[PDB]
Symmetry: D2
Subunit: 327 residues, 4 copies
């Protein structure tokens, strides 16, 4: 199968599996797993933050993030199109008792400053004390503009709130824009980075932040069930992914460009200008028969096509010709 | 003071105090308060619903309403400008583990496309279970044709419909439709007694037997289980029987207030004044501080009620005329 | 009907109803109700505390109390048989996300050893913030020397101390110690006005300024923010000024009921205030006879007279 | 180090690592990972249940189970000494809004107390929905006759029954009774893989189709929804068919350690020593410091035997003899 459904489907490489073979493990509950400790220390330093926490998913990474910034009743301003609001079953509100404050989100993950400013609650009993603003980079494969970020920071400083980044595909934004992680992450108090997407690690994510923030997140990790034992196997794989699989993301972007240009040339509607990273969003002028046709020819997606490690140049051409055949 | 801040400032009349004086009481926890039992029975009959529940406030009425429709993680669709969403500390979510799903609110109506795009069956999504509307949203009446279409939408997916009817009776007299005609499309209705109707304390959550049985259980948990609430309930009853028709006066006072202020550096639309609210713009802090000194109180918004008279409407008109 | 189910059945006296007729009211949401302000000012001052907050029930008062002490995941240690844990549907846990830590109950006291062992710094545990005590508990009086011990325990571990004084004044009149004395070791106190005191509705939560301010905020979220509650509040103020010393009669009448039945299984040492617990269908016989209670438990109050007490003894001796 | 702190310190064996190297994977969200699918189908079939769910820890397994049985305001009666109540930061209550109802806890919960704990139909109380047992509890085996009596009680009240079987396989090999025999009276069972069995990560929640479906939905909400988890799942599958029978050696070595330690100044009864745990009293802090210096680790004092504890390790006796 040529799988263009998501970049999560990425499988561990032989070099990754060999690193997992020789991965020294310990009990993480006692803080005695050398693999997880090395990953957390590396991740924290890589992003220029104090501490880091290793969790089984990006959902937990975000869930614990919003909960460590917001006590019960406290507010978290985020986009209605953001993964934390719509694709995480509103975990932070249901489980953590936090007040989720959705706000319109643009094609890039930018939330209008006037929308966020009006969402910040005045000190009054009818309202919820807003404490945090959430952002997402990348958002639908789009790169969050850096000058905008610096303005949201000044907005957040004006009200003394906090800033969390859902950076599930942060490194895609890094390699596409030409700005480094340290620069993309500096305006944020905390960031979630997914290892189990483009980077190609089998399981996991990192939550990075200040010593106090992480300490509260770690305590909640135990409560939600994220406290594992010998997770050094998974941690090393993530550590491998973070230092060996970053630069080759340019290929995913390259192949996504090639796929986008090959399909835009055809009864198809897609904006080539929206193709910034490893995602191609397209339309027909419908959908069910297209998917059945493509599945029968060993090709998989769901108007969204996502390139990754397992996808090659010949896969790109095979899918382009399948669309061309569909005519 | 001429108090146009809100209709919640309404004071009990001497006739209402009289009914509160001779109110027969019992222990509501045992279900033995005759004043409470009568209000709830009358409330359920008035709206053509199976059962009703007396509560300390409209916040609790709504708190109990959505929690009784939605269990842990289940979703409720409401307006971003709805009182349940922005003026109730998201209690439904914080205390009740309910997923609040705000959609744009225009008029007070929610676009049918916006509601059904918000309705969700998969692991990433919250299962939607309820839709919330607010009749008399900022003094504006919800159209009955819109209610007719909303019911059919929630019937498709087997969802429930709740009415935040804090000022339902303002809508009833102004639109010229019967109470039952406005509440028929709703499974549950929450009506306030402590606003225009003039009762000192409380609200009524109305719905099915089982729904109210759930709300009643939750009322004890949040701490709304009162004892001899008959004195409050009889007041609410007195209001519901004798203070509904005269709301037509509050509308007229607002109408005379709007037309009287529109004739001046004043920005206000007269098509917004449908009931007892007057929304206004200056073409703000020194404005009300000046009015403070003239014994006139408000906060862009001016609301009429029983304690507001014709001479009070003329005085506030005059004060603005001297101000500009 | 002679109603000995609870002191919650107490009705307003004509004097109280009169004070309600003339009660001055405003909007409590803006803090403009002079009736609720006056009761809050009086209640705070009476117990020697910075502030007070008026709520529609004893359940709300306790709910807000623990939620103001303990945030999500924080612990509150209390008695197994305590009202906050046993009879309030675990609202503070379900709605408030606090960890309730029930400890065995001895007079209604908690063994200091049990409370010490209940205090959690580790990720498997919930960080304790509060201990809860109840006075009176099932009518018995909580010993004053034990209170000072608890405060010393609380000061050692940096915790807070809450009193469920739903029947605090029953303890005050029976023990011979002042309100200030029984309340001084507590950071916060709930007082019910709708029991022995005879007010129709509501309780009062008292504590520090910052505490009440947190409770006032949570009051709005739970739906306890009323409008013209001064009529209810003045009724409570009346009860708190007029109905305290006469509780000694309820105690006396409970004492005389207990002696009339203990002669006829009943422990006379447990009859300390206005409650009588006994043992041996019977309820069906009494209901027809014109007498109501629950079970096991008979509770005297404002509306119960000497003739009532004598009549229920006669109904018991016949059965 | 000789690590007798817990059986959680168990390291993967070379064979287990080899099994993890050639383990086939897929995306678990799409249900396409053959490793976890094989583990879950095998786990469900091993215990005679309909379905199973793979999770990052025993804590999450228990957390989702209580939440899948109990909704908001619903009660679950468990042991005060039980892990779900004592050592899981009351996650079920804090996050899941369920009423934890601890009861005095061989690990059994006295029927009379469980009966007294079940709440009657009233607004003051939380409708009880679940009772939780634990086997093994502190190395002690739950008596099978008592289990059949507990099932009688839960059928009587129409409740669910969950097992925290973190060390269930210790019970099966020590009692002679098979897994299905110990698990049959339970609606849901939670087995750990990262303890005695020696897998690096995870547990299985097993139950009915509908139950596990609900647990799967909640798993996503709490963050247990992994991607390529087949590598962990295969190691769990390996341990489940390769490391069960050898748990007898863990019991044998625990027996020998207890026999050798129960020396003057040491107090312990061997009647409690039934599986892989040894609880022992000195007639404490200075002992830990001394043992650590001699390369022995443990945490009244509990000692736990497991996979990488050898016969000549059970040296610990000599150290105990030298110290006292
Ligand atoms: C922006 C973003 N944030 C958080 C998550 C959550 O990660 P987990 O699935 O590991 O919990 C995802 C997964 N997105 C699913 C997809 O693109 O197919 C995501 O795209
Ligand atoms: C539409 C609406 N719904 C619910 C409530 C809640 O009622 P309580 O205040 O009794 O909780 C209000 C209060 N009205 C506030 C105002 O407009 O001034 C309201 O206006
Ligand atoms: C010690 C104690 N605490 C709190 C409450 C709760 O008060 P409300 O009912 O006003 O919420 C009660 C009432 N329980 C005794 C009875 O009802 O007979 C009580 O006895
Ligand atoms: C009976 C029991 N149940 C559940 C758990 C939780 O498992 P996780 O740690 O995988 O969440 C433990 C671990 N108890 C710690 C110990 O005995 O060392 C346990 O002993």
């Amino acid at each position: 199968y040529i799988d263009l459904r998501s970049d999560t489907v990425t499988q561990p490489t032989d070099a990754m599996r060999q690193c997992m073979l020789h991965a020294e493990v310990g009990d993480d509950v006692y803080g005695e797993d050398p693999g997880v400790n090395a990953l957390e220390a590396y991740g924290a330093d890589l992003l220029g933050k104090e501490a880091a926490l290793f969790v089984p998913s990006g959902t937990m990474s975000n869930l614990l993030a919003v909960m460590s910034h917001c006590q019960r009743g406290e507010g978290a301003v985020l986009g209605s199109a953001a993964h934390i609001y719509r694709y995480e079953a509103q975990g932070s509100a249901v489980l953590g008792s936090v007040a989720l404050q959705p706000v319109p989100m643009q094609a890039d993950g930018s939330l209008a400053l006037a929308d966020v400013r009006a969402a910040i609650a005045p000190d009054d009993v009818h309202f919820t004390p807003t404490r945090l603003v959430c952002l997402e980079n990348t958002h639908n494969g789009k790169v969050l503009p850096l000058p905008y970020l610096r303005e949201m920071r000044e907005l957040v400083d004006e009200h003394g709130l906090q800033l969390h980044l859902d950076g599930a595909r942060l490194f895609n934004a890094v390699v596409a824009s030409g700005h480094t992680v340290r620069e993309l992450v500096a305006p944020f108090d905390s960031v979630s980075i997914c290892l189990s997407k483009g980077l190609g690690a089998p399981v996991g994510s990192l939550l990075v932040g200040s010593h106090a923030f992480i300490a509260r997140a770690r305590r909640l990790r135990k409560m939600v069930g994220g406290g594992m034992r010998q997770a050094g196997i998974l941690a090393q794989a993530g550590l491998f992914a973070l230092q060996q699989h970053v630069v080759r993301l340019a290929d995913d972007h390259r192949r996504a460009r090639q796929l986008a240009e090959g399909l835009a040339a055809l009864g198809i509607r897609l904006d080539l200008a929206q193709v910034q990273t490893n995602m191609v969003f397209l339309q027909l002028t419908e959908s069910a028969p297209l998917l059945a046709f493509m599945k029968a020819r060993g090709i998989l997606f769901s108007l969204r096509l996502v390139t990754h490690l397992q996808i090659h140049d010949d896969d790109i051409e095979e899918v382009i010709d399948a669309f061309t055949e569909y005519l």
